[PDB]
Design an enzyme around this catalytic site. Structure first.
Site, PDB file in Angstrom:
ATOM      1  N   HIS B  63       0.808  -1.204   0.000  1.00  0.00           N
ATOM      2  CA  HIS B  63       0.000   0.000   0.000  1.00  0.00           C
ATOM      3  C   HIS B  63       0.844   1.259   0.000  1.00  0.00           C
ATOM      4  CE1 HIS B  63      -0.105  -0.617   4.514  1.00  0.00           C
ATOM      5  NE2 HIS B  63      -0.038   0.718   4.557  1.00  0.00           N
ATOM      6  N   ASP B 205       1.558  -7.908   2.311  1.00  0.00           N
ATOM      7  CA  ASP B 205       1.691  -6.464   2.110  1.00  0.00           C
ATOM      8  C   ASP B 205       3.127  -5.957   2.056  1.00  0.00           C
ATOM      9  OD1 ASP B 205       0.998  -3.735   1.882  1.00  0.00           O
ATOM     10  OD2 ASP B 205      -0.639  -3.906   3.317  1.00  0.00           O
ATOM     11  N   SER B 630       3.228   2.035   8.844  1.00  0.00           N
ATOM     12  CA  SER B 630       3.146   1.194   7.656  1.00  0.00           C
ATOM     13  C   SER B 630       4.566   0.981   7.089  1.00  0.00           C
ATOM     14  CB  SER B 630       2.337   1.909   6.579  1.00  0.00           C
ATOM     15  OG  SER B 630       0.934   1.807   6.736  1.00  0.00           O
TER      16      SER B 630
HETATM   17  C1  LIG Z   1      -3.547  -2.363   5.707  1.00  0.00           C
HETATM   18  C2  LIG Z   1      -3.642  -0.892   5.330  1.00  0.00           C
HETATM   19  C3  LIG Z   1      -3.391   0.029   6.516  1.00  0.00           C
HETATM   20  C4  LIG Z   1      -3.458   1.505   6.148  1.00  0.00           C
HETATM   21  N1  LIG Z   1      -4.108   1.745   4.852  1.00  0.00           N
HETATM   22  C5  LIG Z   1      -4.402   3.165   4.647  1.00  0.00           C
HETATM   23  C6  LIG Z   1      -3.608   3.533   3.434  1.00  0.00           C
HETATM   24  C7  LIG Z   1      -3.957   3.363   2.123  1.00  0.00           C
HETATM   25  N2  LIG Z   1      -2.921   3.742   1.312  1.00  0.00           N
HETATM   26  C8  LIG Z   1      -1.855   4.130   2.088  1.00  0.00           C
HETATM   27  C9  LIG Z   1      -0.583   4.566   1.724  1.00  0.00           C
HETATM   28  C10 LIG Z   1       0.293   4.877   2.739  1.00  0.00           C
HETATM   29  C11 LIG Z   1      -0.077   4.769   4.082  1.00  0.00           C
HETATM   30  C12 LIG Z   1      -1.332   4.329   4.441  1.00  0.00           C
HETATM   31  C13 LIG Z   1      -2.246   3.994   3.436  1.00  0.00           C
HETATM   32  C14 LIG Z   1      -5.308   0.920   4.678  1.00  0.00           C
HETATM   33  C15 LIG Z   1      -4.970  -0.563   4.664  1.00  0.00           C
END
Ligand SMILES: CC1CCN(Cc2c[nH]c3ccccc23)CC1
Ligand SMILES: CC1CCN(Cc2c[nH]c3ccccc23)CC1
Ligand SMILES: [Cl-]
Ligand SMILES: [Cl-]
Ligand SMILES: [Cl-]
Lengths: 697, 695
Positions: B63, B205, B630
């Protein structure tokens, strides 16, 4: 696999049960020539199981088993279904019309007798060997001249087992004065409502209390003010020792049906025809109903029960298809039949392989007809409400084509129209359901196999299903109240004989009956071949690790109190607690409301002697016992035969258990007896019921 | 339990050693030397990443690299759906506007900032939290031309503990960061949005990038002459896996927390922010779902909008569950009462005065904050025609020189973006009718945006009639209506357009509420400086970490599952068997990549499977993480990479206010599963070869 054993099989299973934890003596559990724990088990109201828990005939069963009796005694002033009911004296216990409790007085192997009588064969293909009428004639002959008159309260019945390879005669003692004693409120008795049906973990206190009444000598008698509580031969002691993981548990009850001896071809047919059609058609029906219920609160009220009733067998079929796909059910039936075929070849007896071939060929032969039958039954007979709209009878039509008989015929037709188009019927919701159901049915059933009226979709309406359904309501005498009344004022046979709704209903019922009649002859070669097939299986591997299919007769099952892993990284334990009820509480959801008296008991920790060692209040537990429908209310026993719970459900992962027992997934869902005793005490305040029970610390 | 400053490692080290940490303190964080901290990056200004080779290879979440994968995808080579695997360094794809930030140095500058702050004069000045003021102090301390003397390096000062601690960060930023590898979307985003906030989780991921630099390892914008960066530190990859109770630790950039909320701020968060977002989004989503389920073309157009609304909706549900069940309000009440009792005993009433100020400001702004959330959730984000075109002053002074055609082209471009390929006027009218019915029930006539007064005054309360009239008479109601306007454009028509008046009116109220609410933030911030100073003076900066503020933090815990509800246990590790259980061929969210399905069937797991022969996918830990974490590296007791953090369970969203030991878990992709996908799915062996893999 781990089965539903005959009472007769207890002797050969006893050593395995003792090795697994059983402590009681064999004949204290079941003795063919004397009082045993089997005598405290009853068939409650012709389907459920119950158990005698006092020397004054007190009986425990499920809340869903006693639901009709609780509802029949409920009024707007005293709503016992909603608030519960607790008779504070025996004289306050409510009688129930058309109720019964059946004790299994004696059970006798009559196989040699039946087989000798059957030798008087006029036709080797005769189905008298499975005929309830024929078997009753043999039972009366063995019991004697006027048995029921010479022994009041007693009756005799012969049943076939193992496909006609074993016969037992049951001597039953039936009591018809069985009074309502107590019941928790529906918020406890059916806590999960339909949301938690087939679900483990489970937090439902599924119980209700009755009492068997009899004449002064303990003999059966219909309801009478002079009737006195029954003093029974035997009753269960209630255990307060609870359960621990891996504890031995056993059940006695009346499981209804199983299909343990299906061929691999019958498993494929069950999946690809029965289950796939029921799943597909009910998903369409439920989808339209849900959209309409969510958009109009009045439609939600009218259709909530119909929607819930459709969902129950839909969920069962999903659970069954999951076992077929994931637990190798077809493969295990294939291996069982191949092992018998190889054994028969080695013994020089080809009749077993011939019997399996006959079953496969009959299944393959009836495939198209069975598919057409399930399509019409699920798609139209059950799927469309106007399929059950009024059809004028042979006599009613005649009584319209010169006497006061016309007003009589119109009154009968009006009564049926008022039942069809009742307070819960929406013609608009039915038209939308019919359009989606008929579109699918018309895609699956070719023109030549359609009920005659449905041919008009192609021929008269250019394939427009919506216009065909709209026309049925716009022109039918049963399309609306004003349309019926106009007909009722000037009724003509010519109008009825050409009514689009009458022609649809008649046409679909005609096809439904024709398919049923064409399919019925295929059941007999399968049944006759199953008699040979099961005889082979029994001769090959013995009547030791293969139980006869359930057939609404008394059986025992044993296992352990044990949870399971439903999926990757998820474990469901063996016991639920009162904290789980509180976690699920939703005040604005009728399904998950928590009784204020139960909520305060939890907050105060007023659990008395009913809580476990850690001070937690148990609610339900699960076990590796093998149960099915018919086992609702069954007593669950300790290693010592003491009552530890009442069986009330089975998880959806175990619905496949009716074909093949699933050791790693299938579980009996049982209400803990400590939770039953907590609700009677702290919610009902009915201490006299606790006092009459024999409670062991 | 905490998101600790790098400086706090010394004070926490003994506790971490007692919990299982084996590595030496200065090997993890050294304030004047190379350490594991030097292999951690802030990836693309929000995510975390980590250097995993001596050639600058970087791992982060799928992501996190999603935008870069999508920007390099075409209908011919759809890298987003098929994955991407550069078979040589020259095949790695450059990314415009990307960055990686290394935290070169971190320094406590509290006494310096506090001395500089004495020159303010106005006691209630907010310069102590001002990024412009703090940057002026950072430049002053680093020196006149610091960035010219130290190329690639920049400095930044941030406030911590409500303005009671200041740190200066020296950052090294690289802007040439190329796409190296990514699994297909079926692996990188397996649940799609269905498994978001969910444990058990079966999502691989991850995505792979590479930092490039000039010949001397110095930062440089994209150039064909750029060479991979040879970093001073990179993570070794562990193949030892994880066991229940193993020590785990993470370094990353958590965004925000509210650990020092008063009980009144917890009540406000529940009763205003969360309840309004839950209620309004449930209405919006309910109408959208009905429309998407009835028309497959509406499902295509509205799937993304529906998913975007659902994410913060689920977060708010998870947050309200913690407030209701985990005693969050009660624990903030006990914390503030303990400080108030301590301040009374010491003779200092300023702490109790600071808590009273926060409560009074919260109570005072309640109605305005409720009105703001109602319009924001109900209309600004709830109704699409709220963002329909509003003619500017420059555009109106053109329709009434003949650049009338250029003004019409600007308005047409905005109309075409509003009413695009994914916009349904019918779906928007139905959403607006339900959203406005709720909004009109909650907001009294006197507090309505002026145009919404017409529901009562002109339309006799008929919301459907008012919305139908907006579209029937507006120049943005349909393409034919816009074109008729564009042929004969008059200012008189625009100034009275029902859609323009609605859009202008709702944005006017939205701005007015924002302006009226903004002044209330300052007394709360100033009172929090006193409140947090009291908490620190009373119980010390040992078991109370500063709120997250997008700066480098460490957290530690154990690999451990939890019981979400009565009689249910979720273990600490998921396997490839769980991916196969979830497979649904006719559901695009749960499709399983045929190459991965084949690997599972044939048990071609190599050295990546655990001792029992089962293939691990993800694990969970008691580390304290939030948004910003993340892609964070998850380390062993020895500092070896065991996974990448990618999510947190919904039961732990309340953790931003109060850490939940029995429920909150970091959701981490197992590094063994990352290597399995690179190897058996991508076939990109050169990436495995450049990593230092420990058996
Ligand atoms: C498992 C994920 C956890 C966070 N994400 C939100 C998100 C979507 N795009 C991003 C790009 C960078 C940082 C956070 C995000 C949703 C699912
Ligand atoms: C817990 C489950 C709830 C549903 N029930 C089916 C059922 C409804 N009413 C009954 C009366 C008698 C026997 C079975 C039923 C099976 C068990
Ligand atoms: Cl033979
Ligand atoms: Cl199993
Ligand atoms: Cl570096």
């Amino acid at each position: 696999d781990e089965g539903m054993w005959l009472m007769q099989q207890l002797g050969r299973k006893y050593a395995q049960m003792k090795e697994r934890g059983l402590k009681m003596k064999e004949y204290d559990l079941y003795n063919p020539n004397g009082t045993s724990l089997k005598d405290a088990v009853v068939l409650f109201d012709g389907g459920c199981t119950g158990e005698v828990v006092s020397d004054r005939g007190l009986v425990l069963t499920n809340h869903h088993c006693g639901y009709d009796m609780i509802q029949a005694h409920s009024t707007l002033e005293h709503n016992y279904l909603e608030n519960g009911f607790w008779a504070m004296r025996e004289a306050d216990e409510l009688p129930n019309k058309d109720i019964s409790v059946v004790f299994i007085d004696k059970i006798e192997d009559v196989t040699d007798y039946v087989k000798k009588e059957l030798k008087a064969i006029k036709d080797p293909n005769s189905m008298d060997y499975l005929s309830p009428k024929y078997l009753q004639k043999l039972a009366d002959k063995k019991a004697g001249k006027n048995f029921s008159a010479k022994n009041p309260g007693l009756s005799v019945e012969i049943k076939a087992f193992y496909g006609g390879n074993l016969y037992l005669m049951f001597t039953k003692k039936t009591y018809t004065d069985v009074r309502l004693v107590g019941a928790p409120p529906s918020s406890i008795g059916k806590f999960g409502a339909d949301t938690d049906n087939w679900i483990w973990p489970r937090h439902t206190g599924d119980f209700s209390i009755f009492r068997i009444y009899a004449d002064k000598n303990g003999n059966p008698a219909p309801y009478s003010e002079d009737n006195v509580p029954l003093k029974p031969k035997r009753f269960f002691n209630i255990s307060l020792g609870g359960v621990q993981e891996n504890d031995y548990a056993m059940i006695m009850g009346f499981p209804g049906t199983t299909h343990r001896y299906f061929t691999a071809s019958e498993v494929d047919e069950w999946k690809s025809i029965d289950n796939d059609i029921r799943i597909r058609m009910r998903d369409i029906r439920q989808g339209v109903m849900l959209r309409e219920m969510l958009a109009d609160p009045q439609i939600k009220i009218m259709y909530s029960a119909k929607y819930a009733a459709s969902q129950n067998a839909y969920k069962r079929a999903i659970g069954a298809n999951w076992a077929i796909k994931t637990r190798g059910l077809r493969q295990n039936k294939q291996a069982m039949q191949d092992r018998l075929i190889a054994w028969g070849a080695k013994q020089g007896t080809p009749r077993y392989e011939e019997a399996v071939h006959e079953i496969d060929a009959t299944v393959a032969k009836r495939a198209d007809l069975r598919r057409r039958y399930w399509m019409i039954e699920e798609g139209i007979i059950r799927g469309i409400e106007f399929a059950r709209s009024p059809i004028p009878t042979e006599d009613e039509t005649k009584a319209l084509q010169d006497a006061s008989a016309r007003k009589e015929a119109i009154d009968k037709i009006r009564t049926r129209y008022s039942k069809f188009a009742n307070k819960d019927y929406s013609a608009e919701v039915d038209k939308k359901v019919a359009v989606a159901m008929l579109t699918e049915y018309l895609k699956e059933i070719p023109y030549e196999n359609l009920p005659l009226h449905l041919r008009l979709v192609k021929d008269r309406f250019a394939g427009d299903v919506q216009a065909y359904v709209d026309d049925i309501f716009a022109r039918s005498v049963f399309g609306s109240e004003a349309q019926f009344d106009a007909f009722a004022a000037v009724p003509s046979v010519e109008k009825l004989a050409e009514d689009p709704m009458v022609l649809f209903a008649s046409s679909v019922f005609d096809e439904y009956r024709k398919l049923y009649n064409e399919l019925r002859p295929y059941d007999d070669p399968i049944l006759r071949a199953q008699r040979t097939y099961i005889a082979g299986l029994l001769e090959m591997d013995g009547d030791q690790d293969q139980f006869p299919d359930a057939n609404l007769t008394l059986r025992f099952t044993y296992g352990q109190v044990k949870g399971y892993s439903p999926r990757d990284n998820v474990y469901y334990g063996h016991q639920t607690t009162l904290d789980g009820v509180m976690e699920k509480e939703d005040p604005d959801n009728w399904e998950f409301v928590v009784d204020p008296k139960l909520k305060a008991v939890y907050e105060r920790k007023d659990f008395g002697r009913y809580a476990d060692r850690s001070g937690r209040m148990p609610v339900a537990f699960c076990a590796t016992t093998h149960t099915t429908g018919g086992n609702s209310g069954s007593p669950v026993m300790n290693a010592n035969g003491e009552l530890i719970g009442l069986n009330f459900d089975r998880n959806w992962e175990g619905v496949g258990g009716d074909i093949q027992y699933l050791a790693d997934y299938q579980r009996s869902i049982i209400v803990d007896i400590r939770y039953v005793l907590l609700v009677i005490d702290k919610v009902g305040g009915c201490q006299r019921l606790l006092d009459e029970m024999n409670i062991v610390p």
